[PDB]
Ligand binder design. Structure first.
Ligand SMILES: [Mg+2]
Ligand SMILES: [Mg+2]
Ligand SMILES: [Mg+2]
Ligand SMILES: [Mg+2]
Ligand SMILES: [Mg+2]
Ligand SMILES: [Mg+2]
Ligand SMILES: [Mg+2]
Ligand SMILES: [Mg+2]
Ligand SMILES: [Mg+2]
Ligand SMILES: [Mg+2]
Ligand SMILES: [Mg+2]
Ligand SMILES: [Mg+2]
Ligand SMILES: [Mg+2]
Ligand SMILES: [Mg+2]
Ligand SMILES: [Mg+2]
Ligand SMILES: [Mg+2]
Ligand SMILES: [Mg+2]
Ligand SMILES: [Mg+2]
Ligand SMILES: [Mg+2]
Ligand SMILES: [Mg+2]
Ligand SMILES: [Mg+2]
Ligand SMILES: [Mg+2]
Ligand SMILES: [Mg+2]
Ligand SMILES: [Mg+2]
Ligand SMILES: [Mg+2]
Ligand SMILES: [Mg+2]
Ligand SMILES: [Mg+2]
Ligand SMILES: [Mg+2]
Ligand SMILES: [Mg+2]
Ligand SMILES: [Mg+2]
Ligand SMILES: [Zn+2]
Lengths: 127, 60, 78, 24, 124, 98, 155
RNA sequence: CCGGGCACUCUAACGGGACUGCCCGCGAAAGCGGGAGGAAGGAGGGGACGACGUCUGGUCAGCAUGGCCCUUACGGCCUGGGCGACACACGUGCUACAAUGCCCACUACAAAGCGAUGCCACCCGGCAACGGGGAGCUAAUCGCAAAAAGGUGGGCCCAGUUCGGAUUGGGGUCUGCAACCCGACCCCAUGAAGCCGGAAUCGCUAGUAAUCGCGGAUCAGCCAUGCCGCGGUGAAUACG
């Protein structure tokens, strides 16, 4: 019945659900290709299914919260993987080989005092 | 003139406008806090001793 | 900018109003460069303070919604 | 630009609201 | 078409056109459409002969509109000259006038940076 | 029905003092909702180390205000004796409602 | 850096044509971290390839690139009395970088009002073999060889 | 939203984890390069942490403090002025010179903080700043609140322009006894220099630079474009 994976990527938590059937995709109450209209990176989150090859099979029901639309697309791209990895003891041959598993620890770092932007150091006179 | 001031500050009779702050420990008018009641100088000092409840060398 | 009042200090009109009595002399000093000019207060040259001395400034209708301060120069070398 | 009061941005940058950026 | 004084915008849309008049900004522009009645997207080249009139009428008639406008402006400043109120001067001395830092900037009311100069420090 | 708050500072104590009010709230009758740790409100403030002029290398502190909630389902005259008289907060603070 | 040899950052394949050599470009096209605008332009440019040419977009871009990778450039050097400009080989790594770069710059240097069109046409010319890049490549070429004298400083 | 449910998410408190223990290569060792499993290796990536001493460094104006000096004043109060002066030079900054743009209507994705004569929903008045009413909050359970860039479609058309908002005139609002010197917003009208900056020179090696919006302290109000923080989008390059 339900197939879930914890979608999380840079202050973005996505809830992935996979129901066999058509292929319809939903997020926080909207059609995938509608909630992400404009973002040419949208069709990237579904890329995991496109290599398992098994797209026309899971009516995925997601709900991502927190972060940025793109960040969300990342959280999702991990859920769609973490979710279906569960219901396929053999589908491990992709989440490890085709690097689809990493929280991307890559995240914004604290702004140190005396550095306009956590690193960009102020100007300089000397004279 | 920093003695007569601490007192002058305490008194308040005139227009609430002029009612201004000033460090509790040291007679300092600049960089005080609506909390602690201490000045940056003072605060950090006490802070290091521990006499400032729940206050801890921040870390994140 | 005052739209309900006129913040024009009282020890002025007080001394201006009593002077309004048949209208006598005029020489009158003050430190209210912060108050406003009152209509009909023309002819009442009011020396205003600036921090140094009192500028013997005449006062006429041309100037009214102004402050006696605008009329007193605070700094030197204008 | 962020410097024109009579503009959505300008008003925003200034942290204000008004005829060019009303409160809904 | 000469709508005002001696001003005539061209081959553009009226909403932008009028702008080219002293006294008429973007505001008063659309302010003469709720009372005039015309579709802004229209170029000044093509448009009913009457529209121009009903336009010019409103515009010129309503308020006041280059010269004399531009002329009143002076007077005020002239008036500021009176006995010499503070804000009155500054215009007199050609300095900024709403309290700013003449020390550094203010080059907009100040004359080109008339350099001239100054201090020297002993080498030995 | 009766609600109880738990602020304070050292989450080392507050945790215990709170936890106590359950192992002792069950023995007094009605069941209870396990010590729930709600979010922490924090007080951060920076200061310029030097007492003069050194806007850099300054130093800021924190003041973690831990909160903690727990609640009894049914108000037994039993529990009352305990809670009301078992006031044992070293540096803790507790608010109670309904 | 003096320490390590430094390893090349890898890129994520395109979403439309799926090719790093593409993303690379889009990136170079991107100004102020705004990819959506960076990609569109690029693609919108291809949507203006079929018209100006019944060619497969992917191949024009691919060619344009090849038509600019500078076989060789000159890099300064100090010795004494004056500085000789030594001419030497160029690994694809830098070639691609250069080529790609020149493309974008050249584009924006064009007089086409829209951006799509610029990258667009620019791509075509290059692809063909006569674009600002082509020139900026040729120039670099000229520079070298001519300085073959000092070439014996390959270092 | 109601009943109801801890599975998610999360909040916050306690644990396991990674130790060169495995394999190959080099060696006397320590230990280097390669590889698998793994979320993560060989200090995993950031914080806190800065030796003996150095600059007769800084600060007697935060405080403490030896010596010196003043006492109807070198002490104290007060109203007014000043620290905001301006022919000029520099430092750091902010907004820009535009179509990878600007404007306008609509529609989304944050994090981190903050709040008692305090933040204000929601109404009615006003073009608006804001003002009369008035619900909720002792605040993961109400408010500040809107993220902006983005996405949609609509308007400009390469022009000092619908680029850019300085300057000034007129009309207002709010805090405060009080905005002349000297506050910040608002609206109308003005639309300045600037079409990318000499000699020079700065920052940054990845979630960094660049770019966009947000919180807080101080604080009636505010000259904050500052500072201290948060998050969104998200690169180029490193032969040597
Ligand atoms: Mg950032
Ligand atoms: Mg410095
Ligand atoms: Mg004194
Ligand atoms: Mg005050
Ligand atoms: Mg503009
Ligand atoms: Mg020589
Ligand atoms: Mg390379
Ligand atoms: Mg050996
Ligand atoms: Mg560490
Ligand atoms: Mg010294
Ligand atoms: Mg002392
Ligand atoms: Mg005074
Ligand atoms: Mg003053
Ligand atoms: Mg100063
Ligand atoms: Mg000034
Ligand atoms: Mg929304
Ligand atoms: Mg915050
Ligand atoms: Mg919060
Ligand atoms: Mg209503
Ligand atoms: Mg009220
Ligand atoms: Mg009210
Ligand atoms: Mg202005
Ligand atoms: Mg430049
Ligand atoms: Mg140049
Ligand atoms: Mg040079
Ligand atoms: Mg670095
Ligand atoms: Mg801010
Ligand atoms: Mg404030
Ligand atoms: Mg100011
Ligand atoms: Mg500053
Ligand atoms: Zn103090």
């Amino acid at each position: 019945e339900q197939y879930y994976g914890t979608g999380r990527r840079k202050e973005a938590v996505a809830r992935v659900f996979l129901r066999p059937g058509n292929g319809k995709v939903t997020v926080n109450g909207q059609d995938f290709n509608e909630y992400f209209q404009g973002l040419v990176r949208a069709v990237a989150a579904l890329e995991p299914l496109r290599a398992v090859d098994a797209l026309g099979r899971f009516d995925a029901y997601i709900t991502v919260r927190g972060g940025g639309k793109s960040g969300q697309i990342d959280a999702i791209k991990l859920g769609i993987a973490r979710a279906l990895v569960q219901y396929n003891p053999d589908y491990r041959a992709k989440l490890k080989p085709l690097g689809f598993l990493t929280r991307d620890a890559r995240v914004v770092e604290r702004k140190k005092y005396g550095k306009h932007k956590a690193r960009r150091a102020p100007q300089y006179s000397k004279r | 003139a920093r003695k007569a001031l601490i007192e002058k500050a305490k008194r308040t009779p005139k227009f609430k406008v002029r009612a201004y702050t000033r460090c509790v420990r040291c007679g300092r008018a600049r960089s005080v806090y609506r909390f602690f009641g201490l000045c940056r100088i003072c605060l950090r000092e006490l802070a290091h001793k521990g006499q400032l409840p729940g206050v801890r060398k921040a870390s994140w | 900018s005052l739209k309900k009042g006129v913040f024009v200090d009282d020890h002025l009109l007080e001394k201006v109003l009593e002077l309004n009595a048949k209208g006598e002399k005029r020489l009158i000093k003050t430190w209210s460069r912060r108050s406003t000019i009152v209509p009909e207060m023309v002819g009442h040259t009011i020396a205003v303070y600036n921090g140094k001395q009192h500028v013997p400034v005449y006062i006429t209708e041309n100037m009214v919604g102004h402050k006696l301060g605008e009329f007193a120069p605070t700094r030197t070398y204008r | 630009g962020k410097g024109d009061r009579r503009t959505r941005r300008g008003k925003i940058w200034r942290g204000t609201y008004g005829k060019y950026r009303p409160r809904k | 078409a000469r709508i005002a004084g001696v001003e005539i915008p061209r081959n553009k849309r009226v909403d932008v056109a009028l702008t080219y008049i002293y006294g008429i900004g973007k505001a008063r522009a659309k302010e003469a459409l709720e009372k005039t009645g015309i579709n802004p997207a229209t170029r000044v080249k093509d448009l009913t002969e009457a529209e121009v009139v009903r336009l010019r009428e409103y515009v010129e008639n309503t308020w006041k509109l280059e010269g004399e406008l531009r002329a009143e402006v002076a007077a005020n400043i002239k008036r500021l000259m009176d006995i010499g109120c503070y804000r009155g001067l500054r215009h007199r001395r050609g300095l900024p006038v709403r309290g700013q830092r003449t020390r550094t900037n203010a080059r907009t009311r100040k004359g080109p940076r008339k350099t001239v100069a100054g201090k020297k420090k002993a080498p030995r | 029905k009766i609600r109880i708050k738990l602020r304070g500072f050292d989450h080392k104590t507050l945790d215990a003092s709170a936890q106590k009010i359950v192992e002792a709230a069950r023995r007094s009758g009605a069941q209870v909702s396990g010590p729930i740790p709600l979010p922490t409100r924090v007080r951060r403030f920076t200061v310029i180390r030097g007492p003069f002029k050194h806007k850099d290398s300054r130093e800021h502190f924190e003041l973690r205000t831990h909160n903690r909630l727990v609640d009894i389902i049914n108000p037994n005259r039993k529990t009352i004796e305990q809670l009301m008289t078992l006031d044992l907060p070293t540096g803790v603070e507790i608010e109670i409602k309904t | 850096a003096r320490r390590r040899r430094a390893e090349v950052r890898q890129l994520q394949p395109d979403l439309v044509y799926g090719d790093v050599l593409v993303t690379a470009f889009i990136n170079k096209i991107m100004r102020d971290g705004k990819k959506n605008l960076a990609a569109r332009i690029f693609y919108d440019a291809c949507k203006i390839i079929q018209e100006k040419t019944g060619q497969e977009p992917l191949k024009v871009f691919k060619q344009a690139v090849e038509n600019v990778k500078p076989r060789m450039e000159v890099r300064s050097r100090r010795v004494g009395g004056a500085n000789y400009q030594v001419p030497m080989e160029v690994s694809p790594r830098r070639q691609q970088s250069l080529a790609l770069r020149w493309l974008v710059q050249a584009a924006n240097q064009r007089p086409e009002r829209r951006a799509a069109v610029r990258i667009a046409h620019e791509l075509m010319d290059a692809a063909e073999g006569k674009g600002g890049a082509v020139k900026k490549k040729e120039d670099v070429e000229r520079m070298a060889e001519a300085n073959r004298a000092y070439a014996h400083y390959r270092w």
